[PDB]
Subunit: 335 residues, 4 copies
């Protein structure tokens, strides 16, 4: 029985081959941004409210036209068969059962149509390809398969310098492939417009950190943004999303959904993100720890733990709803 | 002979079973708030005054209609028989003899009437129960037994997630019971009004951290508040009380007594709390360390040590009275 | 050959009995103020000037009517025979030869008249005694013996709680006595006036930390103040003098000399103190390390090292005089 | 194959004699400024831009009338034969091949004419000598040999106190000499004018930290400044250049080139410096690590690694040019 997300990391480190654990855990360069994602969350303290009605505490949100059970989605993580033989299908099944959206990756190790067939609330994460038509075809495939949002990753003109992967000489095992294919181009604002024109689905720009890029995303017709430094895996020295979140929320002024990711490791961290103004969070590495440790059941247990932690934190902070949690104030401390 | 409160923790760790020490020491979640209570106090430095008249230094205060020997009371700590066979009676006797108020708990392991019969200045801490009449009956019992204040704990709609207790599988020994009974409901502002209407005693709301909740407490007719994150045992990531204290003192503008707790471990810490504007502090864990180490005599020695440290700190800071200590300025440093 | 003051501490720790080293090294309480004296200096960075005339760099100052070779004096340290058999005579001789004022203590282990007979620039440090006439007699003795200033210590209404001394059961060896005698009273502003009326010498109030106490010192006719927390030995949690220095210098606006002490361990630290506005610094523990390590010759070597470090730091910062160093700007960093 | 600059330090420590490694690695005094150079860079986070055109990312700059391949030059480091038998010739050859300017030192262990004959973009670093005519002769020699800029080091009126060198008893081996000679005087603003009047080359003042000294440098006709604390080797406690850079860039308002050095250890650090407003950086110790580890080929590999890291960081931050990188915003964090 896992009582924190840290129990799952320990379990995953035991089972996974070192080089695969490093592919999962690592960041770019000196891992400054990877560490800062945690530092930033640890500096935030919540000012809870007391004596409020908690007779019907609900962790639900509405996002992109549908109810979610928590203010949380599974982040896009490439090549999930690296962590467990059932890969993306195990994670998607658990997410569906927990009422949490699951983000299907462009670089999924099971085809997007197979993962979408699991049901639930699939979103689709897009990388822009050298061959543009390939990009727009993926978008159409995702929409045809019932994906509900296009999460366009905008912080990967190319992959960052992952020194753990370089030192390990890491390569995909022959048994893991990019199953949507039978190569990156940098995305631009023109690419965003091409995607927006090609789909009725909300387009969510993932990897926004500058306030003016958040404003421009709204002007460009984005339905959402994810304020994110890609888990510290892209620019080493990029500011944590959590540090830009409040300023971004103020600047977009309700014009789109504002999600955040990077270092969410508890329901308390979800509360902090919400209190700083996030609509919802993405969670990456912990979901893969659970997958590695115990497959679908592991992911189920993680999501049940997170759900309990979110409920606990919200109620202790005097919040009967996620909207109330967004109205909490915070104070920076020292750790 | 103990020369600091840290001597008593070492003594208590030696004698207590690990799981009981963990029940006492622990906090919720990652223990971020537990640690921050100490961090916050360690960041505060006092700007002492020199050359003032110290011919009659007094540590006494008047609070809730009676003199106390120090600006301090024993915090409510449940189930004191866990720490020593005499439990609450040992602590109450020592508090009485030292001229310090003692807070009798709803979850006391000796009945509130027995503890009140010890004499001194008993206060009574209330938890709100699912069965409302049970709550109001406890209040009436406390008043009938001569308790002087009702300390309504407002930060426990339910118990926080104590991971040490979960990992240890901690449960009360068969020989420790909730002796006031032969179950929590969240308290609301309506509950506060019901208590206020049912007693002539001052009602003190314990667990206030938001400035507007402090204001509302005054408007609600509270005689006092305790600015507190419950010793880091409730919301993990809740701001330390000491960090909100100055802002709260300014906002209530003499409308009620403003106490603080969390991490007080010396007379110097009492001085810091006073300098930040507290009327008085509560002390929890150290009192239980002393109880565990040496029963009633241990608690007596702790309170004598604290009294000496408070006198020493006040005089070295140029303060002949607690009111003068409240007029001291402070400066944050780096530790 | 010693290349830093830290070489001398290592040497002193080797030779001294543990309890005597602890009497020297220790502070009050948790030693928070002792550590903060070092933290505060380490946070200060100097903004040096370049390309200035350094053809005649001088470290000299004028203070209390006489030239000193450095902006530095030996702090009052009680009972110097604890550290070396020649005690105060060894230190005073070395100070004289280096052109540095030496502060003779009320609790000197050699009589003030003997130490004054060494020559140089003796100052005299006063503690206020229960028997007032005793205090004023010491002042007259000091003046008759040729002391040039009365350093009235104002932060010792009684001795702080030195936990190292308590734990060691420290007491003076039978062979060390208070040689000025054959008992503390708290000093007040009235005591200061009594001293000022009884002497033509400048009165310097040592242990001022509050800005208004610095202002009042000027109004009271003080010739100087020492901004000081008594080396972290009095109020545990007292702000470092170095943190109050700039504000105090601005407030007194040339009305008296403003010295600082606490944690000066290099010529660079002297430069920092000067850049923050100090007229001069006092140095305590390092002088005793040198005395313990090698007697008079040890103190000589320390003062020669400090002189070289001060000259080096001043010139590298573009300062041909101490006045120029006072006009340097500083910037706080992170350590 | 080296994947970070830290790989090269490890390699250099293995090969070099301890005292030579210490001469290279060390700083003055307590090494506070040496450490702070790294601390300051680690506190800076970049706010990257997304979705910009990256079809022709270029790391080139124009400086002092010529193109450089990166916003970087090799810092002046004395006596390079200490690190490898080919010394300055190996480093200059690699710099030439990489399109990076190389700064020839007054204290080069190969003559400036020999190093200039390598080709590339040689600059010449000047120390002011007691014998003025010697100084101006070096300037004329440098100009006659085809050096493109005079880097006048202004922070060495004399050498700082290098405690590692003092403790090691470090001296030049008989086989390393100052090859430009067959003695320091402090430089002043008059010295700067004498140099400016004696050459048509841009004069660059290296070691400026005060904003008013930067302003005065522009007024004095400097073509550039290097904002620098001399790698923590001169005044111990001098502010890092990176901490003064933004304020200096604002004050000079395009009046000269503003370079920075101290602690640059990656392409990400180059990006940070650029984002804070630097025209270019100097890199010292890492170039010598590469020289020690593998001679000319080692330096080539270092410069290729740095070039890749700079390109990577710029593109990930949305910058197609160094000018765009200068328009990035930054945010301080906690490490
Ligand atoms: C192993 C791994 C693979 C990832 N793959 C992708 C990807 O293909 N597309 C993408 O947009 N983000 C990807 N991310 C970034 C995540 O979506 C997310 O931003 C990050 O994991 C959030 O931080 P967290 O892991 O600290 O929760 C990946 C992250 C990891 C750790
Ligand atoms: C073992 C334990 C039991 C506690 N029980 C109660 C309780 O029943 N009611 C309550 O209001 N607070 C309770 N508290 C919180 C304390 O009243 C107080 O807020 C906290 O101990 C203060 O922090 P300190 O222990 O650092 O002094 C408890 C604390 C501890 C450590
Ligand atoms: C062993 C010891 C004895 C001291 N005795 C006295 C004293 O008798 N009178 C006094 O005014 N200050 C006394 N001081 C305080 C010093 O004058 C001075 O404020 C302190 O040493 C400065 O800090 P530093 O030791 O870090 O340089 C003493 C300090 C020490 C360490
Ligand atoms: C071993 C060594 C020798 C140096 N010699 C000189 C010199 O002769 N002239 C000079 O202007 N700077 C000199 N410097 C300072 C460098 O030019 C530069 O300011 C510093 O190395 C930059 O910091 P970094 O080493 O952290 O990159 C030297 C630095 C080192 C480490
Ligand atoms: O961070 C990651 O690993 C992914 O975003 C990713 C990026 C580029 C190629 C493959 C996978
Ligand atoms: O500086 C601020 O207050 C924010 O940028 C911030 C910093 C660190 C964590 C969260 C939010
Ligand atoms: O913190 C504690 O242990 C008490 O406040 C407490 C809370 C809930 C149930 C029992 C005891
Ligand atoms: O930020 C502040 O100054 C206060 O909130 C505060 C912070 C830390 C300790 C005590 C008080
Ligand atoms: O700090 C010290 O030791 C002295 O100031 C001191 C104070 C009181 C009595 C003796 C000595
Ligand atoms: O806060 C400030 O700037 C000063 O009080 C100060 C703080 C720390 C060291 C020196 C000076
Ligand atoms: O830092 C260094 O070593 C050089 O700047 C230097 C300075 C003075 C003499 C020789 C070398
Ligand atoms: O205080 C500031 O913001 C700057 O001086 C600064 C500080 C630390 C690193 C870079 C820049």
């Amino acid at each position: 029985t896992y009582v924190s997300l840290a129990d799952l990391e320990r379990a995953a480190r035991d089972v996974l081959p070192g080089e695969i654990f490093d592919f999962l855990a690592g960041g770019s360069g000196t891992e400054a941004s990877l560490v800062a994602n945690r530092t930033a969350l640890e500096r935030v303290f919540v000012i809870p409210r007391m004596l409020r009605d908690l007779t019907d505490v609900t962790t639900e949100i509405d996002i992109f036209g549908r109810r979610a059970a928590l203010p949380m989605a599974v982040a896009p993580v490439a090549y999930q068969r690296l962590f467990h033989p059932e890969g993306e299908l195990a994670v998607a099944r658990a997410a569906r059962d927990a009422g949490v959206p699951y983000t299907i990756c462009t670089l999924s190790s099971v085809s997007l149509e197979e993962i979408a067939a699991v049901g639930g609330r699939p979103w689709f994460q897009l990388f822009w390809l050298r061959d543009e038509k390939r990009s727009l075809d993926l978008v159409r495939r995702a929409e045809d398969a019932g994906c509900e949002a296009i999460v366009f990753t905008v912080d990967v003109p190319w992959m960052g310098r992952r020194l753990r992967d370089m030192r390990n000489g890491f390569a995909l095992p022959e048994w893991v492939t990019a199953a949507n294919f039978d190569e990156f181009a940098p995305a631009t604002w023109e690419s965003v417009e091409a995607v927006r024109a090609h789909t009725d689905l909300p387009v969510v720009l993932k990897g926004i950190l500058a306030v003016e890029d958040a404003r421009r995303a709204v002007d460009a017709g984005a339905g959402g943004i994810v304020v994110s430094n890609h888990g510290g895996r892209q620019l080493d020295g990029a500011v944590p999303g959590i540090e830009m979140l409040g300023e971004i929320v103020a600047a977009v002024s309700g014009g789109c959904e504002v999600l955040v990711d990077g270092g969410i490791r508890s329901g308390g961290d979800v509360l902090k993100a919400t209190a700083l103004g996030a609509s919802a969070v993405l969670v990456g590495r912990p979901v893969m720890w659970a997958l590695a440790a115990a497959g679908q059941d592991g992911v189920r247990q993680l999501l049940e733990l997170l759900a309990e932690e979110v409920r606990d934190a919200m109620g202790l902070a005097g919040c009967e709803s996620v909207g109330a949690a967004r109205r909490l104030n915070t104070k920076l401390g020292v750790v």
